[PDB]
Short mmCIF file of C-alpha atoms in Angstrom, two decimals:
data_model
loop_
_atom_site.label_atom_id
_atom_site.label_comp_id
_atom_site.label_asym_id
_atom_site.label_seq_id
_atom_site.Cartn_x
_atom_site.Cartn_y
_atom_site.Cartn_z
CA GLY A 297 27.90 11.57 3.45
CA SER A 298 29.06 12.85 0.07
CA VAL A 299 30.26 9.39 -1.02
CA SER A 300 29.57 6.20 0.93
CA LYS A 301 28.15 2.70 0.69
CA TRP A 302 25.05 3.92 2.54
CA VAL A 303 23.23 7.19 1.82
CA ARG A 304 21.68 9.60 4.33
CA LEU A 305 18.92 11.38 2.42
CA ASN A 306 16.88 14.22 3.95
CA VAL A 307 13.27 14.28 2.70
CA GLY A 308 11.37 17.25 4.07
CA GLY A 309 13.83 17.50 6.94
CA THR A 310 13.42 13.83 7.89
CA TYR A 311 16.48 11.62 7.47
CA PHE A 312 16.13 8.41 5.45
CA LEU A 313 19.13 6.14 6.07
CA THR A 314 19.09 3.84 3.05
CA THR A 315 21.58 2.13 0.74
CA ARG A 316 23.03 3.38 -2.54
CA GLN A 317 21.55 0.46 -4.49
CA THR A 318 17.98 1.27 -3.42
CA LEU A 319 18.34 4.67 -5.09
CA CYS A 320 20.38 3.20 -7.97
CA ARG A 321 17.57 0.71 -8.60
CA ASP A 322 16.65 2.36 -11.90
CA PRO A 323 18.34 5.16 -13.90
CA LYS A 324 15.15 6.95 -15.06
CA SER A 325 14.46 8.14 -11.52
CA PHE A 326 14.88 11.64 -10.15
CA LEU A 327 16.70 9.98 -7.25
CA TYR A 328 19.39 8.56 -9.55
CA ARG A 329 20.46 12.03 -10.69
CA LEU A 330 20.09 13.09 -7.06
CA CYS A 331 22.49 10.34 -5.98
CA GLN A 332 25.17 11.24 -8.53
CA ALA A 333 27.83 13.79 -7.52
CA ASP A 334 27.91 16.19 -10.46
CA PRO A 335 27.49 19.92 -11.19
CA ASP A 336 24.21 21.74 -10.45
CA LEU A 337 23.88 20.63 -6.82
CA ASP A 338 23.55 23.24 -4.08
CA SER A 339 20.61 21.87 -2.07
CA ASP A 340 22.11 19.59 0.57
CA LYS A 341 22.75 19.57 4.30
CA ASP A 342 26.35 20.82 4.37
CA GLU A 343 26.69 20.01 8.09
CA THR A 344 26.53 16.21 7.71
CA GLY A 345 26.58 15.76 3.94
CA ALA A 346 22.90 14.78 3.69
CA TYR A 347 21.04 15.56 0.47
CA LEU A 348 18.27 17.91 1.59
CA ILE A 349 15.42 17.35 -0.89
CA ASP A 350 12.24 19.44 -0.99
CA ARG A 351 9.77 16.57 -1.25
CA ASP A 352 7.17 15.25 1.12
CA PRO A 353 8.14 12.33 3.38
CA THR A 354 4.53 11.17 3.02
CA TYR A 355 4.46 10.20 -0.67
CA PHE A 356 8.19 9.47 -0.81
CA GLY A 357 7.62 6.41 1.38
CA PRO A 358 5.41 4.31 -0.91
CA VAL A 359 7.61 5.29 -3.85
CA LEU A 360 10.75 4.28 -1.95
CA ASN A 361 9.12 0.91 -1.32
CA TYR A 362 8.90 0.49 -5.09
CA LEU A 363 12.68 0.79 -5.46
CA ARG A 364 13.30 -1.18 -2.26
CA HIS A 365 11.19 -4.26 -3.04
CA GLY A 366 10.02 -3.79 -6.64
CA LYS A 367 6.45 -2.88 -5.67
CA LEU A 368 4.69 0.24 -4.45
CA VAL A 369 2.10 -0.23 -1.70
CA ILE A 370 0.04 2.80 -0.75
CA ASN A 371 -0.88 3.56 2.85
CA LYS A 372 -4.48 3.60 3.99
CA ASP A 373 -3.93 7.31 4.78
CA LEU A 374 -2.13 8.34 1.56
CA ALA A 375 -4.07 8.83 -1.66
CA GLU A 376 -3.01 6.76 -4.65
CA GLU A 377 -3.38 10.08 -6.48
CA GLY A 378 -0.55 11.43 -4.34
CA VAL A 379 1.71 8.48 -5.10
CA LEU A 380 0.86 8.89 -8.79
CA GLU A 381 1.92 12.53 -8.47
CA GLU A 382 5.18 11.50 -6.82
CA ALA A 383 5.94 8.76 -9.37
CA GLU A 384 5.30 11.19 -12.23
CA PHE A 385 7.58 13.74 -10.53
CA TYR A 386 10.34 11.13 -10.23
CA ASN A 387 9.65 9.95 -13.80
CA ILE A 388 9.50 6.27 -12.85
CA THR A 389 7.58 5.34 -15.98
CA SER A 390 6.86 1.76 -14.94
CA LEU A 391 5.66 3.01 -11.56
CA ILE A 392 3.59 5.68 -13.30
CA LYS A 393 1.95 2.97 -15.41
CA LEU A 394 1.25 0.68 -12.45
CA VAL A 395 -0.20 3.45 -10.28
CA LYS A 396 -2.28 4.59 -13.25
CA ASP A 397 -3.64 1.05 -13.62
CA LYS A 398 -4.50 0.88 -9.91
CA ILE A 399 -6.20 4.28 -10.11
CA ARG A 400 -8.09 3.14 -13.22
CA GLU A 401 -9.50 0.09 -11.44
CA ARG A 402 -10.30 2.14 -8.33
CA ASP A 403 -12.08 4.83 -10.35
CA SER A 404 -13.98 2.25 -12.41
CA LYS A 405 -15.25 0.86 -9.12
CA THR A 406 -15.96 4.19 -7.41
CA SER A 407 -17.40 6.32 -10.24
CA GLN A 408 -20.40 4.06 -10.83
CA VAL A 409 -21.27 0.36 -10.67
CA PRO A 410 -18.79 -0.74 -7.98
CA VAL A 411 -20.66 -4.04 -8.03
CA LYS A 412 -23.32 -5.66 -10.21
CA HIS A 413 -25.99 -7.11 -7.94
CA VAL A 414 -27.58 -10.43 -8.88
CA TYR A 415 -31.21 -11.08 -7.99
CA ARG A 416 -33.16 -14.28 -7.39
CA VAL A 417 -36.84 -15.06 -6.85
CA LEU A 418 -37.37 -17.73 -4.23
CA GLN A 419 -40.92 -19.08 -4.06
CA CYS A 420 -42.01 -20.01 -0.55
CA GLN A 421 -45.28 -20.97 1.05
CA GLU A 422 -46.07 -19.28 4.34
CA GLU A 423 -45.37 -22.32 6.52
CA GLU A 424 -41.71 -22.81 5.61
CA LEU A 425 -41.13 -19.08 5.14
CA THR A 426 -39.38 -18.11 8.35
CA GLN A 427 -37.04 -21.09 8.26
CA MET A 428 -35.83 -20.59 4.71
CA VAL A 429 -35.44 -16.92 5.54
CA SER A 430 -33.54 -17.91 8.67
CA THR A 431 -31.53 -20.53 6.75
CA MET A 432 -31.19 -18.13 3.82
CA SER A 433 -27.72 -18.48 2.36
CA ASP A 434 -24.76 -16.55 3.73
CA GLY A 435 -23.82 -13.58 1.57
CA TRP A 436 -27.36 -13.01 0.27
CA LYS A 437 -29.64 -10.16 1.36
CA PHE A 438 -33.41 -10.22 1.61
CA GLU A 439 -34.92 -7.52 -0.59
CA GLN A 440 -38.64 -8.11 -0.92
CA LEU A 441 -41.54 -10.38 -0.05
CA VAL A 442 -44.80 -10.20 -1.99
CA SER A 443 -47.97 -12.21 -1.62
CA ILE A 444 -50.00 -13.34 -4.62
CA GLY A 445 -53.76 -13.38 -5.09
CA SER A 446 -55.05 -16.80 -6.08
CA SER A 447 -58.33 -18.46 -6.97
CA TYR A 448 -56.94 -21.64 -5.40
CA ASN A 449 -57.18 -19.88 -2.03
CA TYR A 450 -57.06 -16.09 -1.90
CA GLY A 451 -54.54 -14.76 0.57
CA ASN A 452 -53.55 -17.29 3.21
CA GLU A 453 -53.30 -21.06 2.68
CA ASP A 454 -51.46 -21.12 -0.64
CA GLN A 455 -48.57 -23.32 -1.76
CA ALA A 456 -47.33 -20.53 -4.01
CA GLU A 457 -48.16 -17.99 -1.32
CA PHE A 458 -45.06 -15.80 -1.22
CA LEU A 459 -42.46 -14.62 -3.70
CA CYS A 460 -39.23 -13.60 -1.98
CA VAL A 461 -36.79 -11.50 -3.98
CA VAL A 462 -33.27 -11.80 -2.58
CA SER A 463 -29.99 -10.53 -3.94
CA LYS A 464 -26.26 -10.31 -3.47
CA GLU A 465 -23.48 -8.04 -4.67
CA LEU A 466 -20.84 -9.19 -7.13
CA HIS A 467 -17.27 -7.99 -7.65
CA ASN A 468 -16.97 -8.32 -11.42
CA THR A 469 -16.95 -4.65 -12.42
CA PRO A 470 -13.64 -3.62 -10.75
CA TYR A 471 -12.08 -6.85 -12.06
CA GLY A 472 -13.70 -6.72 -15.51
CA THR A 473 -16.37 -8.84 -17.13
CA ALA A 474 -15.47 -12.42 -18.05
CA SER A 475 -16.82 -14.51 -20.92
CA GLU A 476 -15.63 -17.30 -23.21
CA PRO A 477 -17.15 -18.67 -26.43
CA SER A 478 -18.88 -22.01 -26.88
CA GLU A 479 -21.42 -23.00 -29.53
CA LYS A 480 -23.06 -25.78 -27.53
CA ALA A 481 -23.78 -23.38 -24.68
CA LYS A 482 -25.32 -20.94 -27.16
CA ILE A 483 -27.59 -23.54 -28.77
CA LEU A 484 -28.65 -24.77 -25.33
CA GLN A 485 -29.47 -21.17 -24.40
CA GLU A 486 -31.55 -20.92 -27.56
CA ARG A 487 -33.39 -24.10 -26.54
CA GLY A 488 -34.00 -22.62 -23.10
CA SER A 489 -35.37 -19.39 -24.55
CA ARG A 490 -38.11 -21.20 -26.47
CA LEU B 1159 21.61 -29.32 64.61
CA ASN B 1160 23.67 -28.70 67.76
CA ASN B 1161 24.53 -25.11 66.80
CA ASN B 1162 21.28 -23.10 67.13
CA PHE B 1163 19.26 -25.40 64.87
CA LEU B 1164 16.29 -23.02 64.98
CA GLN B 1165 18.42 -20.15 63.65
CA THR B 1166 19.71 -22.31 60.79
CA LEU B 1167 16.13 -23.21 59.89
CA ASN B 1168 15.30 -19.50 60.11
CA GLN B 1169 18.06 -18.54 57.66
CA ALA B 1170 17.15 -21.33 55.23
CA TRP B 1171 13.52 -20.26 55.32
CA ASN B 1172 14.45 -16.61 54.81
CA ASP B 1173 16.40 -17.60 51.71
CA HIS B 1174 13.34 -19.57 50.56
CA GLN B 1175 11.09 -16.53 51.01
CA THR B 1176 13.43 -14.01 49.37
CA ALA B 1177 13.84 -16.28 46.36
CA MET B 1178 10.13 -17.16 46.31
CA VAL B 1179 8.86 -13.58 46.20
CA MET B 1180 11.02 -13.08 43.12
CA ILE B 1181 9.88 -16.39 41.61
CA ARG B 1182 6.27 -15.24 41.96
CA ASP B 1183 7.29 -11.93 40.38
CA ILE B 1184 8.58 -13.76 37.31
CA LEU B 1185 5.67 -16.19 36.90
CA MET B 1186 2.78 -13.81 37.52
CA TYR B 1187 0.97 -14.91 34.37
CA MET B 1188 0.97 -18.63 35.10
CA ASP B 1189 -0.52 -17.73 38.48
CA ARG B 1190 -3.06 -15.58 36.64
CA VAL B 1191 -4.45 -17.47 33.64
CA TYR B 1192 -3.23 -21.08 33.81
CA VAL B 1193 -3.91 -21.54 37.53
CA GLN B 1194 -7.35 -19.92 37.27
CA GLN B 1195 -8.41 -21.83 34.16
CA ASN B 1196 -7.02 -25.13 35.48
CA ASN B 1197 -8.14 -24.85 39.15
CA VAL B 1198 -4.68 -25.66 40.52
CA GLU B 1199 -2.34 -24.08 43.03
CA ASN B 1200 -0.28 -20.98 42.39
CA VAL B 1201 3.50 -20.77 42.71
CA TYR B 1202 3.63 -19.33 46.23
CA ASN B 1203 1.50 -21.79 48.21
CA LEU B 1204 3.16 -24.51 46.14
CA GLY B 1205 6.56 -23.44 47.43
CA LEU B 1206 5.27 -23.19 50.99
CA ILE B 1207 3.73 -26.68 50.83
CA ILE B 1208 6.94 -28.10 49.37
CA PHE B 1209 8.92 -26.45 52.17
CA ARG B 1210 6.51 -28.09 54.61
CA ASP B 1211 6.76 -31.56 53.06
CA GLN B 1212 10.52 -31.53 52.44
CA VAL B 1213 11.89 -29.87 55.60
CA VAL B 1214 9.29 -29.72 58.36
CA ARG B 1215 7.69 -33.09 57.54
CA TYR B 1216 11.05 -34.84 57.71
CA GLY B 1217 11.73 -36.95 60.79
CA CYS B 1218 14.96 -35.58 62.24
CA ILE B 1219 14.14 -31.92 61.58
CA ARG B 1220 10.58 -32.40 62.85
CA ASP B 1221 11.40 -34.10 66.14
CA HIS B 1222 14.52 -32.04 66.87
CA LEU B 1223 12.55 -28.83 66.30
CA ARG B 1224 9.67 -30.05 68.47
CA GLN B 1225 11.86 -31.15 71.38
CA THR B 1226 14.07 -28.05 71.23
CA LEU B 1227 11.01 -25.78 71.21
CA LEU B 1228 9.35 -27.65 74.08
CA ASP B 1229 12.51 -27.51 76.21
CA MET B 1230 13.06 -23.84 75.36
CA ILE B 1231 9.51 -22.84 76.27
CA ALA B 1232 9.70 -24.85 79.50
CA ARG B 1233 12.93 -23.05 80.41
CA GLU B 1234 11.34 -19.68 79.59
CA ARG B 1235 8.43 -20.72 81.81
CA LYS B 1236 10.92 -21.29 84.62
CA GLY B 1237 12.20 -17.74 84.03
CA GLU B 1238 15.49 -18.59 82.31
CA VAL B 1239 16.79 -16.08 79.77
CA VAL B 1240 16.42 -17.73 76.35
CA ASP B 1241 16.02 -16.21 72.90
CA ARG B 1242 12.34 -15.29 72.75
CA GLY B 1243 12.76 -14.04 69.19
CA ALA B 1244 13.81 -17.53 68.14
CA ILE B 1245 10.58 -18.88 69.64
CA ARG B 1246 8.60 -16.21 67.78
CA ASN B 1247 10.32 -17.11 64.52
CA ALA B 1248 9.64 -20.82 64.95
CA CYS B 1249 6.02 -20.22 65.92
CA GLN B 1250 5.30 -18.10 62.84
CA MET B 1251 7.07 -20.65 60.63
CA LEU B 1252 4.88 -23.39 62.05
CA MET B 1253 1.86 -21.08 61.67
CA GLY C 1247 23.81 4.16 21.08
CA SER C 1248 25.73 0.93 21.57
CA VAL C 1249 24.85 -2.50 20.19
CA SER C 1250 24.93 -4.96 23.09
CA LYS C 1251 22.73 -7.43 24.97
CA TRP C 1252 20.15 -4.79 24.09
CA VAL C 1253 20.54 -4.17 20.35
CA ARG C 1254 20.00 -0.85 18.56
CA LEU C 1255 18.76 -1.44 15.00
CA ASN C 1256 18.29 1.29 12.39
CA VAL C 1257 15.17 0.43 10.38
CA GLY C 1258 14.35 3.06 7.76
CA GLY C 1259 16.61 5.55 9.53
CA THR C 1260 14.86 5.19 12.88
CA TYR C 1261 16.36 3.29 15.80
CA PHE C 1262 14.54 0.46 17.55
CA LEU C 1263 16.19 -0.57 20.82
CA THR C 1264 15.13 -4.17 21.47
CA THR C 1265 16.24 -7.26 23.38
CA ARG C 1266 18.52 -9.94 21.93
CA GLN C 1267 16.27 -12.92 22.67
CA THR C 1268 13.20 -11.02 21.42
CA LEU C 1269 14.72 -11.17 17.94
CA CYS C 1270 16.24 -14.59 18.72
CA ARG C 1271 12.70 -15.88 19.33
CA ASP C 1272 12.64 -17.88 16.08
CA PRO C 1273 15.47 -18.75 13.61
CA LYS C 1274 13.26 -18.33 10.49
CA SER C 1275 14.05 -14.62 10.12
CA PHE C 1276 16.37 -12.03 8.58
CA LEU C 1277 17.26 -10.80 12.07
CA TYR C 1278 18.40 -14.20 13.36
CA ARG C 1279 21.68 -13.91 11.48
CA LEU C 1280 22.06 -10.26 12.49
CA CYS C 1281 21.79 -11.33 16.13
CA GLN C 1282 24.68 -13.72 15.50
CA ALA C 1283 28.23 -12.47 15.09
CA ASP C 1284 28.71 -11.55 11.45
CA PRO C 1285 31.93 -10.76 9.56
CA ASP C 1286 29.70 -10.94 6.48
CA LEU C 1287 28.19 -7.50 7.15
CA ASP C 1288 29.33 -4.28 5.49
CA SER C 1289 26.39 -1.81 5.40
CA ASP C 1290 26.20 -0.71 9.03
CA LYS C 1291 26.28 2.81 10.44
CA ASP C 1292 29.77 3.37 11.84
CA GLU C 1293 28.82 6.95 12.78
CA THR C 1294 26.68 5.69 15.68
CA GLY C 1295 27.66 2.02 15.68
CA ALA C 1296 24.21 0.75 14.67
CA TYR C 1297 22.99 -1.60 11.96
CA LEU C 1298 21.34 0.42 9.20
CA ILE C 1299 18.65 -2.08 8.09
CA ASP C 1300 16.54 -1.26 4.99
CA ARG C 1301 12.68 -1.44 5.42
CA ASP C 1302 10.12 1.20 6.58
CA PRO C 1303 9.67 1.47 10.40
CA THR C 1304 5.88 1.63 10.04
CA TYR C 1305 5.48 -1.87 8.58
CA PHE C 1306 8.41 -3.04 10.72
CA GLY C 1307 6.27 -2.10 13.73
CA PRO C 1308 3.74 -4.94 13.56
CA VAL C 1309 6.55 -7.35 12.64
CA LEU C 1310 8.43 -6.38 15.80
CA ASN C 1311 5.22 -6.70 17.81
CA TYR C 1312 4.71 -10.22 16.46
CA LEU C 1313 8.32 -11.16 17.10
CA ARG C 1314 7.95 -9.95 20.70
CA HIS C 1315 4.59 -11.62 21.35
CA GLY C 1316 3.73 -13.94 18.48
CA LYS C 1317 0.77 -12.02 17.05
CA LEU C 1318 0.41 -9.36 14.38
CA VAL C 1319 -1.43 -6.06 14.79
CA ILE C 1320 -3.14 -3.96 12.11
CA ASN C 1321 -3.68 -0.23 12.60
CA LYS C 1322 -6.42 1.71 10.85
CA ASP C 1323 -3.73 3.89 9.23
CA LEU C 1324 -1.27 1.08 8.39
CA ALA C 1325 -1.53 -1.14 5.32
CA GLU C 1326 -2.07 -4.85 5.82
CA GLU C 1327 -0.28 -5.39 2.52
CA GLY C 1328 2.62 -3.29 3.78
CA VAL C 1329 3.20 -5.40 6.88
CA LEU C 1330 2.67 -8.41 4.61
CA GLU C 1331 5.60 -7.44 2.40
CA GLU C 1332 7.58 -6.51 5.51
CA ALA C 1333 7.08 -10.12 6.58
CA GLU C 1334 8.10 -11.20 3.07
CA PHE C 1335 11.48 -9.45 3.23
CA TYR C 1336 12.26 -10.51 6.80
CA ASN C 1337 11.06 -14.07 6.10
CA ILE C 1338 8.97 -15.25 9.03
CA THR C 1339 6.79 -17.84 7.33
CA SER C 1340 4.36 -18.16 10.24
CA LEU C 1341 3.96 -14.38 10.30
CA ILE C 1342 3.63 -14.37 6.51
CA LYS C 1343 0.78 -16.88 6.76
CA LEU C 1344 -0.85 -14.96 9.61
CA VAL C 1345 -0.78 -11.60 7.80
CA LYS C 1346 -2.02 -13.33 4.65
CA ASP C 1347 -4.96 -14.67 6.67
CA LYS C 1348 -5.57 -11.17 8.04
CA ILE C 1349 -5.71 -9.79 4.49
CA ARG C 1350 -8.01 -12.70 3.62
CA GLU C 1351 -10.36 -11.74 6.46
CA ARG C 1352 -10.34 -8.07 5.43
CA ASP C 1353 -11.16 -8.97 1.83
CA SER C 1354 -13.77 -11.60 2.72
CA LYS C 1355 -15.65 -9.23 5.02
CA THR C 1356 -15.70 -6.91 1.98
CA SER C 1357 -15.90 -9.68 -0.65
CA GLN C 1358 -18.64 -10.30 -3.21
CA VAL C 1359 -20.08 -12.80 -0.71
CA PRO C 1360 -19.98 -11.11 2.72
CA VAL C 1361 -20.02 -12.95 6.03
CA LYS C 1362 -22.29 -10.41 7.74
CA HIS C 1363 -26.10 -10.14 7.82
CA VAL C 1364 -28.67 -12.48 9.36
CA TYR C 1365 -32.41 -12.39 8.88
CA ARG C 1366 -35.44 -13.27 11.01
CA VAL C 1367 -39.18 -13.28 10.42
CA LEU C 1368 -41.11 -12.20 13.49
CA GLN C 1369 -44.87 -12.46 13.22
CA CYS C 1370 -47.35 -10.12 14.88
CA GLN C 1371 -50.88 -8.87 14.41
CA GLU C 1372 -51.80 -5.19 14.36
CA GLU C 1373 -52.49 -4.98 18.09
CA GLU C 1374 -49.00 -6.06 19.16
CA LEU C 1375 -47.30 -4.57 16.10
CA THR C 1376 -46.00 -1.26 17.43
CA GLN C 1377 -45.02 -3.06 20.62
CA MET C 1378 -42.43 -5.40 19.15
CA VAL C 1379 -41.48 -2.78 16.56
CA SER C 1380 -40.56 -0.22 19.20
CA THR C 1381 -39.04 -2.67 21.69
CA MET C 1382 -37.07 -4.28 18.85
CA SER C 1383 -33.51 -4.97 19.95
CA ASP C 1384 -30.48 -2.77 19.44
CA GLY C 1385 -28.06 -3.62 16.64
CA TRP C 1386 -30.90 -5.19 14.64
CA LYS C 1387 -32.23 -3.30 11.61
CA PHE C 1388 -35.85 -3.55 10.54
CA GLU C 1389 -36.05 -4.61 6.91
CA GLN C 1390 -39.66 -5.02 5.80
CA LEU C 1391 -43.17 -5.35 7.16
CA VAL C 1392 -45.74 -7.24 5.10
CA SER C 1393 -49.41 -7.81 5.66
CA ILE C 1394 -51.03 -11.04 4.52
CA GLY C 1395 -54.02 -11.60 2.31
CA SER C 1396 -56.92 -13.08 4.19
CA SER C 1397 -60.11 -14.94 3.44
CA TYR C 1398 -60.58 -15.52 7.20
CA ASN C 1399 -61.63 -12.82 9.68
CA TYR C 1400 -62.15 -10.02 7.15
CA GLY C 1401 -61.04 -6.60 8.32
CA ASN C 1402 -57.70 -5.67 9.79
CA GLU C 1403 -57.10 -8.71 12.00
CA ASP C 1404 -55.47 -12.13 11.60
CA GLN C 1405 -53.29 -14.49 13.61
CA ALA C 1406 -50.55 -14.04 10.99
CA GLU C 1407 -51.77 -10.63 9.85
CA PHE C 1408 -48.29 -9.11 9.74
CA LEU C 1409 -44.85 -10.58 9.16
CA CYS C 1410 -41.92 -8.37 10.14
CA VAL C 1411 -38.65 -9.38 8.51
CA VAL C 1412 -35.72 -7.89 10.41
CA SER C 1413 -31.99 -8.40 10.18
CA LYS C 1414 -28.63 -7.38 11.51
CA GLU C 1415 -25.10 -7.30 10.20
CA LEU C 1416 -22.61 -9.73 11.69
CA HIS C 1417 -19.01 -9.66 12.84
CA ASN C 1418 -18.48 -13.39 12.47
CA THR C 1419 -14.83 -13.19 11.40
CA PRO C 1420 -13.22 -12.44 14.83
CA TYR C 1421 -15.59 -14.56 16.92
CA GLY C 1422 -15.44 -17.52 14.54
CA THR C 1423 -18.08 -19.91 13.28
CA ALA C 1424 -19.95 -22.40 15.46
CA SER C 1425 -19.35 -25.20 12.93
CA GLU C 1426 -17.31 -27.88 14.69
CA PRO C 1427 -17.62 -31.66 15.12
CA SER C 1428 -20.46 -32.72 17.42
CA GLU C 1429 -22.43 -35.85 16.58
CA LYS C 1430 -25.41 -35.22 18.85
CA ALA C 1431 -25.75 -31.81 17.21
CA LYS C 1432 -25.83 -33.53 13.82
CA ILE C 1433 -28.52 -35.94 15.03
CA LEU C 1434 -30.62 -33.06 16.34
CA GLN C 1435 -30.18 -31.12 13.09
CA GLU C 1436 -31.28 -34.12 11.04
CA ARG C 1437 -34.28 -34.76 13.30
CA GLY C 1438 -35.41 -31.14 13.10
CA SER C 1439 -34.75 -31.04 9.35
CA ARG C 1440 -37.48 -33.54 8.46
CA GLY D 65 19.19 3.97 38.37
CA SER D 66 16.31 6.42 38.08
CA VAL D 67 14.07 5.47 41.01
CA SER D 68 14.14 7.71 44.05
CA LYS D 69 10.73 9.38 43.74
CA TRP D 70 10.20 9.61 40.00
CA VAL D 71 11.14 7.21 37.20
CA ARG D 72 12.77 8.26 33.93
CA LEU D 73 11.94 4.96 32.27
CA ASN D 74 13.12 3.89 28.81
CA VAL D 75 10.15 2.18 27.16
CA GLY D 76 11.68 0.85 23.95
CA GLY D 77 14.24 3.63 24.14
CA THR D 78 11.49 6.24 24.50
CA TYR D 79 11.88 8.43 27.58
CA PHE D 80 8.90 8.43 29.94
CA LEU D 81 9.58 10.58 33.00
CA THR D 82 6.59 9.68 35.16
CA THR D 83 5.59 9.38 38.79
CA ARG D 84 6.19 6.15 40.69
CA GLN D 85 2.97 6.69 42.65
CA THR D 86 0.64 6.75 39.65
CA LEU D 87 2.70 3.80 38.42
CA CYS D 88 1.75 2.07 41.68
CA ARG D 89 -1.85 3.16 41.13
CA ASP D 90 -2.60 -0.28 39.70
CA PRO D 91 -2.77 -3.02 42.36
CA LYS D 92 -0.02 -5.05 40.68
CA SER D 93 1.51 -4.89 37.19
CA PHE D 94 4.72 -5.67 35.35
CA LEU D 95 5.77 -2.03 35.73
CA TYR D 96 4.97 -2.25 39.44
CA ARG D 97 8.06 -4.44 39.94
CA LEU D 98 10.09 -1.67 38.27
CA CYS D 99 8.74 0.90 40.74
CA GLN D 100 10.82 -0.56 43.58
CA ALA D 101 14.61 -0.53 43.35
CA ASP D 102 15.83 -4.05 42.61
CA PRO D 103 19.12 -5.45 41.26
#
């Protein structure tokens, strides 16, 4: 309708039956000027009064969620690049900023160093080996086992027989590195170095 | 009991069966999962057993049915025209 | 269509024709009140006599599936966060908790400490090596083969001459852990521990 | 009423015009009750 409590928008030929206030959520949106009844409007469905807009119903959805519940959530089948495109087209500056931040974190993860693996050197003699490999902690991956030559007993029968390098991934790069200052920790680290 | 007792029992049973088919149709799932996992009876044999223990295994109905059926089959043995279909109905009920 | 014992609800602009008790399953909901007679309502489609309810149909899908049969469902094209916020608006606290736990499972399976992976150390000598290597079970991934140093039976032969560490990823989240109270199990674990 | 040979069922309001025989293909199902005309 031309004027009503509820609005019947037509995105890409698909009707969205929403409320005026969802579109009137913010006044820096393309949809706000779309909602207003003023000169320079000739693109509408003149058979029902629906505003026929040439925009994709794909990326309009996540954007419409932003004005419907304050947040934009992208689909698993819609690129956050596409929703950034749509937000920039509709000039929702706050939405542009938030989608840019999400894309920044995603690209920091994907471009390189999605994770920063941590590595540990377990030292196991042959007897216990299998068990502590079997009971090796959840979330850790075996990476290497190396024997060591010894004059105590070369090859087999050694209590420092095997050095097992294990590792696990760490999500600290997409979230950012964390550190806080403390002088006692630093002096203890200096003690440990010597 | 005086007015074609067997036919009254027939009608009451037919109502039982028509309702009971539907009742099974509603509670298919409890027949399926709960009965199987709990090793109990289903709805249908439950209803049949309850019909047995609340109508057939009740003194007056039991003895009246037995005596009426015995007299009817004796009369049919003598060659007297009696409702054979009633006998068939009662025999399948008791089956 | 008419709104009756079977109710026609316009979510996102698309009509869902559902059963009154299906929505009346639990009071904790937006739709409970809508099922009840309401003179409080003003934004309903009088052109077709249906309630125009704001919220995308895609994320309303899993919510309706839950409210029919008490469990959520996550598609590979649908966002878990989207159905989460759909639960948030419609206010079904049990469904909110369930979808939150689903998101928790999705993140944990992809978290910095994964639930997958499990490691074994088979032991074989050269003669039987290719045998258990080739016959090695499906779904398991070979990880490393190590020889062992030897001061006993020089030449390529020993009773522990090769240790084959293999592994496989796990799908522990749907099946669930085997950790549950059982005292005899605890006794056995303690006895085998020492 | 849609059942004489072929059912024009309304699954969630979605029209499914299908055959009652392939519906009865399964030994017994919730749809199977809908195959036969009942009040």
